[PDB]
Amino acid sequence: MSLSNKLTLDKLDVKGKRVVMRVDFNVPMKNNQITNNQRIKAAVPSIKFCLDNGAKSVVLMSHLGRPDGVPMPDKYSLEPVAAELKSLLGKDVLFLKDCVGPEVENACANPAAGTVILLENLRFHVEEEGKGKDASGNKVKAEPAKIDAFRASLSKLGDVYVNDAFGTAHRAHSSMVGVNLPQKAGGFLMKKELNYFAKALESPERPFLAILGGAKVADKIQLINNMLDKVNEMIIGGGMAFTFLKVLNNMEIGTSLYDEEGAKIVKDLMSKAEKNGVKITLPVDFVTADKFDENAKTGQATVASGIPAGWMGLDCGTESSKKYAEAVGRAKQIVWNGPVGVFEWEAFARGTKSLMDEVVKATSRGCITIIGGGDTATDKVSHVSTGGGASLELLEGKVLPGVDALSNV
Numbered sequence: 409m410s411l412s413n414k415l416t417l418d419k420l421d422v423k424g425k426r427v428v429m430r431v432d433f434n435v436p437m438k439n440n441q442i443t444n445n446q447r448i449k450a451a452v453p454s455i456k457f458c459l460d461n462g463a464k465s466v467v468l469m470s471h472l473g474r475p476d477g478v479p480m481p482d483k484y485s486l487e488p489v490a491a492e493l494k495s496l497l498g499k500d501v502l503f504l505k506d507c508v509g510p511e512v513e514n515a516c517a518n519p520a521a522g523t524v525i526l527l528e529n530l531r532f533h534v535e536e537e538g539k540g541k542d543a544s545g546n547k548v549k550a551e552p553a554k555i556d557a558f559r560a561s562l563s564k565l566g567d568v569y570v571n572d573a574f575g576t577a578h579r580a581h582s583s584m585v586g587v588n589l590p591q592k593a594g595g596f597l598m599k600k601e602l603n604y605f606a607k608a609l610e611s612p613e614r615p616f617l618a619i620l621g622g623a624k625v626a627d628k629i630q631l632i633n634n635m636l637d638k639v640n641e642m643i644i645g646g647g648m649a650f651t652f653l654k655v656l657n658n659m660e661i662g663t664s665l666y667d668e669e670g671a672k673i674v675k676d677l678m679s680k681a682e683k684n685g686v687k688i689t690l691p692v693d694f695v696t697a698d699k700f701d702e703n704a705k706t707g708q709a710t711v712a713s714g715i716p717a718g719w720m721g722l723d724c725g726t727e728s729s730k731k732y733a734e735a736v737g738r739a740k741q742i743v744w745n746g747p748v749g750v751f752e753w754e755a756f757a758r759g760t761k762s763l764m765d766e767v768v769k770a771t772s773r774g775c776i777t778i779i780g781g782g783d784t785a786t787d788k789v790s791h792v793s794t795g796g797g798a799s800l801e802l803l804e805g806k807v808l809p810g811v812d813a814l815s816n817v
């Protein structure tokens with residue numbers, strides 16, 4: 409699973425060379441204001457490395473949002489990201505208003521030593537994804553010749569290629585799998601992410617506990633299945649749990665999330681767990697709400713009492729947190745993916761906060777702790793992933809096209 413077999417940046421000579429580098433700068437924004445810069449900071453070590461080892465230039469390219477192959481510079485520009493990178497680098501970032509074409513190529517052909525360039529959003533061109541939508545919202549497909557010419561343009565921007573875009577590594581997009589340079593190395597973020605997930609999934613310290621939260625079950629059946637073959641314990645929490653509780657324990661769940669497709673395979677999953685000796689910890693109590701709202705009336709219920717009158721469970725309860733904390737207590741390795749409550753809303757955040765507390769504690773006493781960033785919870789853990797969709801693929805046992813496209817050693 410690791411990058412052990414692939415060319416990496418640490419064994420790539422960059423002195424005197426232009427580095428074209430694909431990063432995941434697809435950060436959360438609001439009114440063209442960045443609201444979480446973790447993805448930017450995470451790329452800094454590879455960038456600083458290139459600079460400190462004499463790279464003539466570092467050309468950065470990324471997508472942002474899903475403009476679907478039409479320029480939306482007033483909604484999805486990376487310009488704000490150039491300013492943020494400058495502050496983090498403590499160095500000028502030259503921002504270009506496009507990512508391919510004669511002007512961008514001229515700009516990148518032979519820059520003054522040490523220049524850092526950020527290109528404009530790759531997805532302003534339908535050739536990045538290979539498909540998209542026209543200006544009228546009709547789906548469109550990119551044309552092979554134009555995809556080729558798009559790729560050839562990007563490839564002209566450097567002498568060697570580094571992909572540090574772990575967050576995008578599940579996407580076989582042009583900048584990810586289509587750069588035609590002989591040396592294609594993974595950066596430090598790509599390497600670090602893959603080392604942590606490879607350790608956890610191939611060679612974990614045991615007991616190995618997976619904490620799987622989130623909402624829907626149907627789309628996580630493969631994930632759960634694969635994890636049941638690797639873990640010793642598994643917490644199944646968040647909206648997902650109600651499907652298991654209704655099916656396995658006859659629980660009355662009110663209007664709580666229920667996955668009819670998921671319910672059909674629940675017993676199969678649990679049979680697999682029991683055969684494998686995996687201890688499953690589901691919630692035993694809940695914070696309830698009379699409506700799906702931040703300011704709903706709240707209540708408390710257990711599995712035994714049921715969730716009442718059209719009410720829904722939006723967080724686990726105090727006793728669930730204890731069960732979770734015991735499982736965390738027993739873990740030497742933890743992978744946490746998906747939230748266990750609706751923690752954006754403070755009345756339903758307690759479950760998540762207690763659990764993060766337990767996971768931070770475990771780290772302090774030597775537990776290897778891997779959490780997702782963003783959807784899972786709100787640097788006192790071993791590894792916070794920058795890739796949610798991408799890590800999900802890894803957890804399901806799938807291949808990362810961004811990783812396969814790299815040169816072997």
Ligand SMILES: COc1cc2nc(N3CCN(C(=O)[C@H]4CCCO4)CC3)nc(N)c2cc1OC
Binds near residue numbers: 647664665749
């Ligand atoms: C217990 O943890 C969770 C519960 C979640 N529940 C929900 N829903 C969303 C769908 N729901 C509704 O539409 C309401 C409105 C009347 C029917 O119930 C209620 C349940 N959604 C979610 N996104 C939930 C997420 C959760 O944790 C991550």
